[PDB]
Amino acid sequence: XXXXXXXXXXXXXXXXXXXXXXXXXXXXXXXXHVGKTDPGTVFVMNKNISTPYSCAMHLSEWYCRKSILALVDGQPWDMYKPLTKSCEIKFLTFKDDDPGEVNKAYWRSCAMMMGCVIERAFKDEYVVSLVRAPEVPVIAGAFCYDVVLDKRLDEWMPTKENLHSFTKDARALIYKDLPFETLEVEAKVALEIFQHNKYKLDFIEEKASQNPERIVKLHRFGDFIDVSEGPLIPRTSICFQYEVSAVHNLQTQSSLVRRFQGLSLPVHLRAHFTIWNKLLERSRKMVTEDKT
RNA sequence: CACAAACGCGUCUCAGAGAUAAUUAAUGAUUUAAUCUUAACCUAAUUAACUCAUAAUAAAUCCAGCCCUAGAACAGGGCACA
Numbered sequence: 001x002x003x004x005x006x007x008x009x010x011x012x013x014x015x016x017x018x019x020x021x022x023x024x025x026x027x028x029x030x031x032x033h034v035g036k037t038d039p040g041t042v043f044v045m046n047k048n049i050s051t052p053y054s055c056a057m058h059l060s061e062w063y064c065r066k067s068i069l070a071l072v073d074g075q076p077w078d079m080y081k082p083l084t085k086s087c088e089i090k091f092l093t094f095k096d097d098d099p100g101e102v103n104k105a106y107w108r109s110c111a112m113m114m115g116c117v118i119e120r121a122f123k124d125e126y127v128v129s130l131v132r133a134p135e136v137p138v139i140a141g142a143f144c145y146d147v148v149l150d151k152r153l154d155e156w157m158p159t160k161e162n163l164h165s166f167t168k169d170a171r172a173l174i175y176k177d178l179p180f181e182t183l184e185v186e187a188k189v190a191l192e193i194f195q196h197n198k199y200k201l202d203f204i205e206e207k208a209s210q211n212p213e214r215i216v217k218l219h220r221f222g223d224f225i226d227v228s229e230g231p232l233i234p235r236t237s238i239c240f241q242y243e244v245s246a247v248h249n250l251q252t253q254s255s256l257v258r259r260f261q262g263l264s265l266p267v268h269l270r271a272h273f274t275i276w277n278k279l280l281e282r283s284r285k286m287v288t289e290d291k292t
Numbered sequence: 293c294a295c296a297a298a299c300g301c302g303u304c305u306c307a308g309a310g311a312u313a314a315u316u317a318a319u320g321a322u323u324u325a326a327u328c329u330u331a332a333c334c335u336a337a338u339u340a341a342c343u344c345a346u347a348a349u350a351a352a353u354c355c356a357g358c359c360c361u362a363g364a365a366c367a368g369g370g371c372a373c374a
Contacts, residue, residue, distance in 0.1 A: 095374090269374065272354095 001126060004196070009223045012193055016183045016220070023184065024048050035088035052089050053079040053234070068093045068102050068238075069231055076101045078231035080182040094267045100139075101231065103266075107143035109180075109233035110242065110264040111135045114145055116224035117170045118260070128153055133199040133257065138291045145260045148199075154256070163244040170242045173222070177236045181220035190216050193225065200227065240268035245283035248290060261287040 029048040033055055035041060043055065052072070056064045056079070070079045071090035083089075094102055115132065122130045129150035136144040187208050194200040204227070208216060219226050233239060243262050250257040263283040270276055 267374085271373070 001123060005223055008193060012225055015185060015189045019185055031083060032086045033089050035090060037090040049082040052083055055089060063091060066093055067091055068234060079234055104137060105231040106233060106264055106266060107137050108228060108230060111143050111145050112219060112221060112226045114170060115226055116221050117166060117173060119224055121166060121169055132197050134203050140291050142286050142291055147258055149258055158247060167244050174236060174239055174242060178222055180232055183218040183220060184215055185218050187214050187216055190218060241265045246287040
């Protein structure tokens with residue numbers, strides 16, 4: 001499973017390098033960024049596939065480190081979202097009155113993150129087998145990560161120490177400080193990469209083919225790749241803590257589905273350890289609910 | 293005593309025990325048939341110091357900010373954070 005993951009990561013890196021090469025082949029472009037977040041700001045630079053986060057860096061280190069999301073021409077985008085021609089750049093943060101976008105992005109980042117973690121733990125033991133299902137976001141403050149496993153994992157029970165170890169590895173990758181990557185790829189090469197995952201194949205085939213856009217955004221964290229229609233968390237330093245609350249088993253059309261669920265911590269801030277235990281209980285209860 | 297504080301002039305408390313002092317008082321008893329608290333040896337009893345069966349001590353790893361009978365700073369305490 002290590003050779004297949006290394007070959008898939010090498011094929012994804014070659015496809016990302018080829019797409020990036022063919023898209024950035026012309027390095028002559030005009031990027032004008034003008035808008036008022038704080039009072040007015042006017043800047044003009046020449047680059048292709050320009051990053052608004054680099055403009056945040058251009059302003060100062062403070063607004064840079066406090067940058068979470070980027071509102072462009074009224075449309076909310078990730079800070080890694082490339083800009084072209086004239087654009088109006090606004091900096092959206094958690095403390096702002098509109099938590100929704102950064103919240104959704106946060107939950108989708110947490111789902112992805114564990115998408116990597118579980119896989120890495122499953123790369124520790126060759127006995128286990130993992131197949132990723134689609135993820136279900138919940139605006140109630142929940143996120144559900146769906147997956148299916150080998151029969152051996154169906155026979156063997158998920159002891160508490162296990163999930164604790166998953167949490168430890170999650171925090172490990174959290175303080176490892178690994179930057180997220182944003183790739184623009186065709187549905188074809190993507191289909192080829194996701195061939196080993198049936199649910200993702202069905203996802204792309206059914207949903208993405210109906211969509212007029214053949215350009216899909218692949219978010220890469222470590223050796224893990226995920227499909228996202230929306231913004232991602234800026235860095236690994238943004239997420240202070242993570243926890244694994246509980247799992248569920250659903251039976252549909254004579255098929256079994258294993259759904260893992262947990263919670264996340266915004267703006268690197270926790271009130272106390274008591275309210276943390278309370279957050280554990282709340283987490284598990286929200287897992288028992290399984291909102292849809 | 294002109295705030296709810298600090299004081300005595302006011303009130304309360306003060307304890308075993310073990311061992312040895314230098315004197316001094318002995319038991320069976322040699323060397324030296326007697327005698328002898330001593331040479332040996334089991335052993336009876338004797339100020340303060342010299343010591344404790346013990347009483348005070350130590351859960352670091354956030355503490356912004358607001359307060360305190362706490363306070364030079366610091367330290368200590370208390371305030372139902374985002």
